[PDB]
Amino acid sequence: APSLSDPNWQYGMGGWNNPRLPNFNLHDPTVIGVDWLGFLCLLGASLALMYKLMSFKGPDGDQEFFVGYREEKCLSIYVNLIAAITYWGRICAHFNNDMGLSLSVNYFKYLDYIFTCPILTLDLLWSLNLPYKITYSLFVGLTIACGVFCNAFEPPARYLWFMFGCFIFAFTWISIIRLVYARFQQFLNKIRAPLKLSLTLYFSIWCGYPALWLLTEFGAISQLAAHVTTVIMDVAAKSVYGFALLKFQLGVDKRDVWLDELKSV
Amino acid sequence: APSLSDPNWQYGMGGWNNPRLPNFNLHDPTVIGVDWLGFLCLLGASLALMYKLMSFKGPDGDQEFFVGYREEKCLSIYVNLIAAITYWGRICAHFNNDMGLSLSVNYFKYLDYIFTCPILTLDLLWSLNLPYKITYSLFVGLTIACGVFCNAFEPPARYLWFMFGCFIFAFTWISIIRLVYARFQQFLNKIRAPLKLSLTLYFSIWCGYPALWLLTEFGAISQLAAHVTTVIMDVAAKSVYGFALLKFQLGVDKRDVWLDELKSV
Amino acid sequence: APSLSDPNWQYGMGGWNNPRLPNFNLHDPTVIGVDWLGFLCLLGASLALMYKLMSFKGPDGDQEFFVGYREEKCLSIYVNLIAAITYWGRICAHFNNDMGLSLSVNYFKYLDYIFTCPILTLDLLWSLNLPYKITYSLFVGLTIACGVFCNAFEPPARYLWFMFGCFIFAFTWISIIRLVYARFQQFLNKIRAPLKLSLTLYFSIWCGYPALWLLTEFGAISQLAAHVTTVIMDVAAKSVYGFALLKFQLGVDKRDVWLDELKSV
Ligand SMILES: *C/C=C(C)/C=C/C=C(C)/C=C/C1=C(C)CCCC1(C)C
Ligand SMILES: *C/C=C(C)/C=C/C=C(C)/C=C/C1=C(C)CCCC1(C)C
Ligand SMILES: *C/C=C(C)/C=C/C=C(C)/C=C/C1=C(C)CCCC1(C)C
């Protein structure tokens, strides 16, 4: 009796077809332009990061492959490159008239984030030498899986999965923010306002994904606007972050007095 | 000519439909109750482990994030949490009348074990400082993949995959048991009978999965009884294990004389 | 309007059905024999590597589990074993008349390579102590994913994915070859011609995969010949490599003067 096809519901792209959202035309000029812009931004950021890292000769300017033997510094590059590949799929799907198996790369919403967000969290926590560097990465991965199930499934299980992922993300993100603030309250030793604004806005960009999902679900924001905003948030979250960290963890052993093991909060 | 739909066989939930097993009603009160109990047990165990670990301040009571900078101690928590998420899916599938895409979380038998058993084996071998700590984890993962293919496929390939996974598991488990006995014959220095009973019964719980599959396949044990027994075995294998290890590897560097590199068997 | 089924194209095994290639009879005696030979070769190589590694007692002949506590030496074994499992699936699919769900193990071309090539690259770069040991592993993985999408999708997106994977592989492989030549120009201190021939032919075997795909795509080489050549290339690339490295990185700490961190190219 159990089956994957409930005959009381409709299905389409990405799983359950919400009866209140109209069909989203993936072949609109706005969508093609925005996807091209996102792919170009991510690929350019990845190439520039790779050039700036591999070309670094070390603090004393004699160590070829200085970053090659210190792999944790390259963790940013992958986060961009994988994203670029995902966006490349979108471009391919438009050359195929947004048709057939080519859509499979981005068929399920938030699935592409499974291979990026955990690595971004891991690199952010490793760069600042913070505790629970992988535990929170796994928690973010489970959040992404919860979101994938939520967007794929029918209303009841969809909302239950959303709630599960929401508490997991809330706990992990509050913990990460407290750790990062504790670490950065030592750096302060003009920079204060810009640093605080950058930190709070970077946290807000992450917090804005579930807000966008909720706005899209109940017909507040249109699907086209949601797509454009999602592309902008992905670019802002991934491209800048690596460049911001590049001028910070270059030519260091990552065990300085500033970045020693966190003590007393 | 090749196709994924052999017209000489029937198909249903989880792949091939055995013509000798009746359809298993996933919407039975017993199944809902047992799945709720399993989810509650796994989630409670995960939360209690997380609280007891993150709250540990170190041997001298001055190291906040003592476990945060020693990640290998948290490897237990993930094993539970992932399991809980899997069980959460079951609960979601019952709120959706055991219908539609919601079943996809537990569509394929033993697939959920792919992300838990390797981590459990890795943590068990790392805690006791034993050799081949990852090789046996990968072997267990390949065993889980073999079981997934076995349950998914039609009789001939099903039995061949079962046989392959069976020898892999036999070799890996005998090796692990010999290593664990060699390590624990030093600890003995009242505890002997309880420790031996706990160790042998924990090994028996792992050994009982293929036995349950064989009993279910040939109509000895009913599918409902198999489901209840599988839930009990999962709880026993995962919830207790972490709590048992918690009072052992707390506030240590994991390189003591007892847990030095194994020598002479 | 978007759907995974473009009605202007045909579909079959592995995704898009090329209208210029005839249906490939997977139940031909040549295919069964070649798959059996490949499975036997990979499994025998894995078993012999495992026996020769686990049985090593260390440089001074007193360290049981010498390789067990030095895991990076076993990275070869997994590369073979996983491959064997994949080939096992093929054998299973022939016992099921090349029918039904059993084909799912090898439904998508190059998907099986996702879990082998990255590990092979990682082990090769780690054994010689070379930089970017994981970055190039991830690049090879993304190349394999690009190839999977290329073979799965319809002509336009297929060729675009092929081009993307082709540049990624070109960059990564030229970088790896330059690093390996730089490392091995120190070893030279009769061996020169055999070593150079082995190195260049091993690189050529890797370079020959996209060449085989291009030859198959445009009806130059027949599908049966492509299958046999692919099996031979897999055996040559995986079985020999581990045995070649076995007599090199046995009973060493992997930080000798020859294998110190690469300097000045
Ligand atoms: C580059 C892409 C990034 C950083 C994406 C991040 C995505 C999230 C943090 C998503 C979070 C979600 C929840 C907290 C609730 C469930 C829905 C999600 C997946 C959108
Ligand atoms: C928490 C869940 C756990 C520990 C599950 C463990 C499962 C196994 C050890 C399964 C083993 C199997 C075989 C040895 C043969 C093939 C069938 C399996 C997968 C049930
Ligand atoms: C044991 C199997 C091995 C080593 C397989 C290796 C495969 C490749 C290096 C494949 C490379 C490809 C490209 C560079 C272009 C796209 C097509 C591929 C995947 C065949």
From TrEMBL, chains A, B, C:
It is a multi-pass membrane protein. GO terms for cellular component: membrane. It comes from the Eukaryota. It is found in: Membrane. The keyword Transmembrane helix applies. Belongs to the archaeal/bacterial/fungal opsin family. This is Cation channel rhodopsin 4. It comes from Guillardia theta (Cryptophyte). The lineage of its organism: Eukaryota, Cryptophyceae, Pyrenomonadales, Geminigeraceae, Guillardia. The chain holds residues 5 to 273 of 367 of the full protein.
